[PDB]
Symmetry: C4
């Protein structure tokens, strides 16, 4: 038994051309065939008529944080138990999945949220996207991802390497191995200061070359990719030269960093949305903590500008929003931002399909609508190439050959 | 006073020939003489008539885990106290000893099981084989031998170096020295991922070159041999180049690793039995944990094939079964497996006598029936060279000049 | 609206000349203009008539310890809670501020005293000088700044790196990063033994070259300056060669150390006052602990002599008293000491204005009475150039364009 | 006021000749003059008539353990509180002092015994010799001086560097600095296994070259001498090459180690007495623990032989007994042992006066009866050069110009 889909229009992920009237055949969780025109459907077990829709391969977001959504000081709850993070993550994942993103890379949570959610989803306990998690983001004492920042002296215990806070190359290995132990698919580190952390710096280098080299060599031994938070150029370059797979945000990326990324084939995940988010919010008094506000006003506005520079220079780019800052499910806005800043619509869609698939090392199974690959497809009314914002209304989502939406 | 033994046939451990009708004279715990033919016995304090038996030197198993026996999820007890491990070890050791293995190398237990058993046996508290223990196997965070794997976050404390879990060269020394402190004769490490561990990888490199070098240099200072668990080729080679004494399993051993082992004179302990064990069991649903099942199906079947390759290539080989996986006392099956995969029967017996004696650095006192060496002998009805499976019926076991069985 | 000040005499911080009759115009927290003669005041919102005073820019002390004041064994309280240190610090800061010091560099306290005081002052909770803090001084086990010295075995827990006691380069980074985490502006370490610490040595090298190099490289990544306690020449040179910003005390500074400081552009903060303090007190029986007394008698008298040598040799010098030893508010005496030991009065005043501003990296905003810079000014009756001790009677203090005293 | 002493015979520590009829004048704690013949005494405040005695300078023992005395398993108390060690140390020190040893180097105790005793004596709380302590002997995990050896798993906590058990160069520094913190004058380490420790090895190398180098460089920064326990040649050489001040025992010292010690000017402290002690006792069943007995039988007998070899080869030698093994107060027997093994009597006495003074870096103040040096003198009836065993009857002991015995 097989499923036949009549696609009015088709963006396959590889071809720079929007193809008209195509037949996609699904067998199990695989795309078994692709024929031109609308072939007869009377002989197929199931038929999905999307002649009035534009079909695309499942979309991917390389930077999400299911389990959290940034709230102002006035709105933020007093505390958030781990159980609450997990509970909220189920909903965050579902709305993201329903909006068209069938695969996501969670690069940071308290530790076991995305890992547990991924396992529950993969074993059919609930619906959601394919999740590739990094578990606890690794940082150095006081770093952007140190979970004990913003706490009075007697209100916290100094973190140990296994908890994601390290100093030196040996503690780095302990931390990387701990993520492997927790069940993570990859590694995430904050190579420079950050914005939303209750800490002084928003961009200083927080990993020594020896420490970030240790991250790469350790992750390589465990077959783990390495995503890297970085705003300041210096920390960013220590990571690019070390051989990490991707730089997130890269706010103050300079000319040298750009050529280094091109030479090493490093992926750039802009998260323009999150950038615009903190900018806008930085104008509201007491929205952010006082120590955070300055950083948000500085970093946020520069991402859109850095994005254009990186794109024109030829830096590899993969789709990433940093959803968990802004509300989950608004991932599509990232496309509109990428376009307004110089990237043509089709190139933008390819950055969330094939480019993301390569960064996650799964391009041979997902990322495009081609015979043999896994059946992850979405559909929407309208032409994304003429107005990519139409992607806000994805109304059909198929994952692993199964239809959830539509 | 002396003991005279009339051996119908004699496999001495050195000669590639089965000798007929030999007289072995035992004085104390030493083999004092070896004369041809059946000399008069009327003048000896004790006489052991084995004219209808084939005598061999005591057999050796370089890889056993007294104190445990792998059981399915359905059969496995909820918990196993240290006292229970020790209690069960007494029986495991005795049945192994009674089957003909007078000397064994225990390469791993919770920490003090084999060490305590060895001391009890050596001081005459109970009967058993000569035991050479490694105590707690050393691993890196999350490694195959990390005793805290498979445990929820709040259900375990991060292990310290002294407990056998390390990161970096200094923690390695602490761990090696701790084994010396506990009373171990040697060291055992998991240089790559493993099968029966509740962990993602079954073969990734888990020791850096610096860390495994530290293992060798540290063990050398304490006159300790180094046994190494290794399935993946990369971790395996880091260990071979570091100078370890033996590689256990070596499932995905490649051409380069083989020449390295030959050049460094490293011993290969196949444990084909354990390999075949996990393969067969991997076909039974819910026998192994879900995370373990895939690894067992992959690794297990390849050992028999790797064994043949290693043997023909000329890699040194010493007898080892990994009994503790399969039931203790079925050690003999390893011989049948070695033969079916290309090794002639006599060479197989020599690998459990003289080859094992060299790996344990005791070839000048055990390993062959020669004048001067310790009186460790076994006997069996039948010719092992024509059907080595006959070794399942060893009916005479002499250790240190004393008769236990027969 | 603006404020007009008629200054009888003016020492601006840059010019080696005392200028007569000058008009300074303050707009907000900025010095908007400087005109010659006494311009009309009828048109200014506010007028400050100081025609009978000598105006100078706000003074700076590069070495203070608000929160403590050394007391004899007989006078010292049994214990001092952290809350008491903070409470006393508010007063210590205010009297120092009222004496003319508008900016100070606190280089050491239990950890969060100066940091908390600085934040309270900067947010307008109370009056005080501009504070730049180093938080907890970093030391090696048993070092001059180890807060657990002088305690019986069962009366203390071995300190961890985050508490300011380190060993090796990795623990150094943890300690430097912890100060960044606590909110410090800079770093302070004891590179050699000290006087007031209950420890055997008063000058031995307590940081290895590798450890102090780690301090500099770590602090550089966080944009933190590095102040260094040092009496012995060897520890001092390890720090000078490492690239620290300033050497405090430098009691046994040798010819080589002097040229090194000149070559690297390192600042010398003498603290002659504190030196003379421990000398005088060392003559009183039981004033200092018995283990401290010898060190105080040795180190204290040499500072005045070393100061002259350093000055004539051309070593850069910035004003620093080590107030917290002697009473707070007597900072002015340091000027008289600098003069009596060879430094001309004007050069002394410049060392507490522009030289201090450069060491704190704020010379572009403070340190001199020049158009554009921040409005930090003081006034006194008399000519400081003819008798610098007149600075004991500063009667006008303006900070950030606001008048507190006068 | 001064004291006059008429010495029948005089061994001054420098001259290889026994001088006849000499007058020694004591002024305060100093030897103010030395005249030939017996000058008039009617004009001196005090007179000490020793015309019938042989006077020598105060004797020194470079290796003592006040606070302990090795007892058989049958005699040993169940436990020894720290308070008991200290209490017993007062007596051990006094009897040693009364036997003629005015200065001793304690190289090991639970931690604060010798340090506390030294301070009590130096401040006049009680009588005893001048003590130079090393505090807690530093060792690596399981090493000869690991205070947690011989304890069941749940009966001890893994020691930290500050407690004297280390791994790696950084932990070494923490341990050396901790001894400085406790108040030690020097450092003592066990570079190889030992005899009286409940551990497997009695001579294996237990410090890596990097670790022992760290001991020297760390101790040098604190002006501390380094004494080294060593039986095995390999560990011994790592220490000699590192630059330690003395090797204790040096049981299996080889030709290479001897030339190295000569080239580096390292002192050899034989402790022949302790050697002979464990030998004799090793013949008594159950005197030593079973794990210790073998080591004692092996090491003990070789010291006397190694001593002769070292002496003839020209290796520097300083007097040391390891009293604390054998009873305290029997220190004199070491002289008789040194003589019987090839060292002439006078050379033996010089090894406990000037040679010891050089090793303790106090040869400019003690070690010989010369004008200007401190007044530490002893007397005995008889000629030590003809029968050094006469030193068992020292009946006059003067320390710091004060008479205690006689
Ligand atoms: C895209 S703006 C930067 C957002 C990021 N989560 C940070 O806190 O630095
Ligand atoms: C011989 S198959 C491998 C068995 C080994 N005990 C493991 O778990 O990897
Ligand atoms: C200026 S004299 C030295 C004072 C310094 N606080 C010390 O204790 O060494
Ligand atoms: C002088 S024999 C050796 C004695 C030393 N205390 C040891 O236990 O090794
Ligand atoms: Mg993020
Ligand atoms: Mg095994
Ligand atoms: Mg100070
Ligand atoms: Mg000793």
């Amino acid at each position: 038994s097989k499923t036949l889909i009549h696609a009015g229009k088709l963006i396959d992920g590889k071809s720079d051309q929007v193809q008209s009237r195509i037949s996609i055949v699904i067998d199990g969780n695989i795309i078994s065939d692709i024929k031109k025109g609308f072939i007869s459907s009377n002989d197929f077990e199931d038929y999905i008529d999307l002649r009035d829709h534009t079909v695309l391969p499942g979309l991917m977001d390389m930077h999400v944080h299911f389990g959290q959504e940034y709230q102002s000081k006035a709105q933020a709850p007093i505390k958030v138990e781990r159980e609450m993070q997990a509970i909220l993550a189920t909903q965050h994942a579902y709305v993201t999945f329903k909006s068209g993103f069938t695969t996501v890379r969670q690069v940071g949570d308290s530790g076991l949220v995305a890992i547990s959610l991924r396992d529950a989803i993969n074993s059919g306990k609930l619906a959601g996207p394919r999740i590739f998690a990094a578990g606890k983001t690794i940082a150095t004492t006081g770093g952007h991802a140190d979970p004990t920042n913003g706490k009075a002296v007697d209100d916290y215990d100094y973190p140990v390497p296994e908890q994601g806070v390290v100093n030196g190359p040996y503690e780095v290995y302990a931390a990387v191995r701990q993520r492997y132990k927790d069940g993570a698919d990859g590694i995430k580190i904050t190579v420079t200061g950050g914005v939303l952390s209750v800490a002084k710096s928003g961009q200083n280098p927080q990993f020594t070359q020896e420490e970030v080299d240790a991250v790469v060599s350790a992750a390589k031994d465990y077959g783990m990719w390495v995503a890297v938070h970085a705003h300041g150029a210096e920390g960013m370059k220590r990571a690019i030269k070390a051989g990490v797979d991707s730089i997130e945000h890269g706010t103050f990326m300079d000319l040298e960093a750009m050529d280094l990324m091109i030479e090493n084939g490093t992926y750039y995940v802009p998260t323009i949305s999150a950038g615009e988010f903190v900018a806008e919010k930085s104008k509201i008094d007491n929205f952010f903590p006082e120590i955070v506000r300055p950083k948000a006003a500085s970093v946020g506005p520069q991402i859109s500008d850095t994005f254009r520079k990186a794109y024109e220079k030829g830096v590899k780019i993969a789709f990433g929003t940093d959803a968990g800052v802004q509300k989950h499910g608004t991932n599509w806005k990232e496309f509109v931002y990428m376009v307004e800043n110089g990237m043509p619509a089709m190139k933008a869609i390819q950055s969330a399909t094939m480019e993301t698939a390569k960064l996650l090392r799964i391009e041979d199974k997902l990322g495009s609508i081609e015979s043999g690959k896994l059946a992850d497809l979405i559909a929407v009314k309208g032409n994304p190439i003429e107005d990519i914002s139409v992607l806000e209304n994805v109304d059909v989502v198929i994952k692993d050959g199964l239809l959830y939406e539509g």
